[PDB]
Amino acid sequence: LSQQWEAGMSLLMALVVLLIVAGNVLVIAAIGSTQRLQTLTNLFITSLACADLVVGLLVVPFGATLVVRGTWLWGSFLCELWTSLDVLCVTASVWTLCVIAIDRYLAITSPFRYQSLMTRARAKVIICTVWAISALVSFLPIMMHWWRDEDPQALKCYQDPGCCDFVTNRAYAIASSIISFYIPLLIMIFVALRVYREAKEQIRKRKTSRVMLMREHKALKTLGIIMGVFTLCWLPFFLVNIVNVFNRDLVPDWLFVAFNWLGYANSAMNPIILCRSPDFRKAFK
Numbered sequence: 001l002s003q004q005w006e007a008g009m010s011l012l013m014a015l016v017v018l019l020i021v022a023g024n025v026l027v028i029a030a031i032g033s034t035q036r037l038q039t040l041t042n043l044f045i046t047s048l049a050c051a052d053l054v055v056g057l058l059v060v061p062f063g064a065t066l067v068v069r070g071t072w073l074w075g076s077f078l079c080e081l082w083t084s085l086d087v088l089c090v091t092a093s094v095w096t097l098c099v100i101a102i103d104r105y106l107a108i109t110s111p112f113r114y115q116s117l118m119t120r121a122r123a124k125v126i127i128c129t130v131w132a133i134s135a136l137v138s139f140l141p142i143m144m145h146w147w148r149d150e151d152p153q154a155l156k157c158y159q160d161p162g163c164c165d166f167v168t169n170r171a172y173a174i175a176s177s178i179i180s181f182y183i184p185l186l187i188m189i190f191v192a193l194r195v196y197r198e199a200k201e202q203i204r205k206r207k208t209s210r211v212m213l214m215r216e217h218k219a220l221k222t223l224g225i226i227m228g229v230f231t232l233c234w235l236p237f238f239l240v241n242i243v244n245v246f247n248r249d250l251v252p253d254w255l256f257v258a259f260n261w262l263g264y265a266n267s268a269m270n271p272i273i274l275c276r277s278p279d280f281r282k283a284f285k
């Protein structure tokens, strides 16, 4: 019966991996093989797609084996690397959504300046800075063991190469969550709502035709959907992560894991969402 669950979950995880990996390669292949999709925003989309791709190839396969076997098979170093890449992908994603919100705000409010000043190369530089800072804030604290808790349970997990539970002290949990999630999430939401407001005002009345503005706003809508779904997928985990560092009995471990898998599931959603945008649909066809 445990073999039926092992075999059953194994196959379900293979399909999740295939969906995340294939989905996010297509998105990147759609963008790179099509003139229409060579926009600055879609270079920022490529960063999200890269983060979702790392999740599909490195994070989810290691995670699947932990869920199905109930122990960590890959030793203490790969536990630490796995955790660092997991943290990196979430951080780079939410900061990239924050860059997209800000970019688009400046694009609608100063289209004249924006278009003379922003270039394809300058977008890549911003993306690099995001991933470089994300890697700093992600890898450094994990390398330095700033996250470790002093409880016997925690210490036993650290002595055991078979335990890869990210048991953390409250200082690290609150601080890392603020820098890597809550701050960029709040900036993204605040700025996106203003973009929504300003787009909404421009159609109501730019010299631009009203039908051209509606085509601009369909693309803006895709981004807000990605933004909204990212929030739904990750905000539960991060709220529960805080509750769990204050009291471990308030959140059972299996429930913690379920919330985590809702987060990983976001990596599968974006290609499917991008599929319903008009230009991306043609490209996939």
Ligand SMILES: CCCCCCCC/C=C\CCCCCCCC(=O)OC[C@H](O)CO
Binding pocket: 136, 137, 140, 141, 146, 147, 148, 149, 150, 168, 169, 170, 171, 172, 175, 176, 179, 245
């Ligand atoms: C630039 C990188 C930014 C990354 C974000 C900053 C991370 C640093 C946070 C804490 C370090 C200190 C760790 C040791 C502190 C122990 C505090 C403590 O005792 O807290 C709870 C207790 O362990 C029961 O859960």
Ligand SMILES: CCCCCCCC/C=C\CCCCCCCC(=O)OC[C@H](O)CO
Binding pocket: 188, 189, 192, 193, 196, 221, 224, 225, 227, 228, 229, 231, 232
């Ligand atoms: C609960 C999630 C909270 C987090 C939220 C993150 C920020 C997202 C911001 C705006 C929503 C984007 C979608 C806006 C769509 C407006 C389109 C519209 O006008 O309505 C239907 C359309 O007319 C039919 O053709």
Ligand SMILES: Cc1ccc(OC[C@@H](O)CNC(C)(C)C)c2cc(C#N)[nH]c12
Binding pocket: 083, 086, 087, 088, 090, 091, 166, 168, 172, 173, 174, 176, 177, 180, 181, 241, 260, 263
């Ligand atoms: C800054 C940052 C980014 C992403 C995070 O969680 C992502 C989640 O997928 C982690 N999964 C494992 C628990 C399996 C490592 C956390 C957790 C903490 C804590 N404490 N800090 C994080």
Ligand SMILES: NC(=O)CN(CC(=O)O)CC(=O)O
Binding pocket: 074, 075, 076, 077, 161, 162
């Ligand atoms: N066997 C190894 O290569 C590494 N070991 C030790 C470690 O990961 O620190 C794993 C184990 O003892 O189960």
Ligand code: NA
Binding pocket: 048, 051, 052, 089, 090, 093, 266, 267
């Ligand atoms: Na992601």
Ligand code: NA
Binding pocket: 076, 079, 157, 158, 159, 160, 161, 162, 163, 164, 165
């Ligand atoms: Na361990």
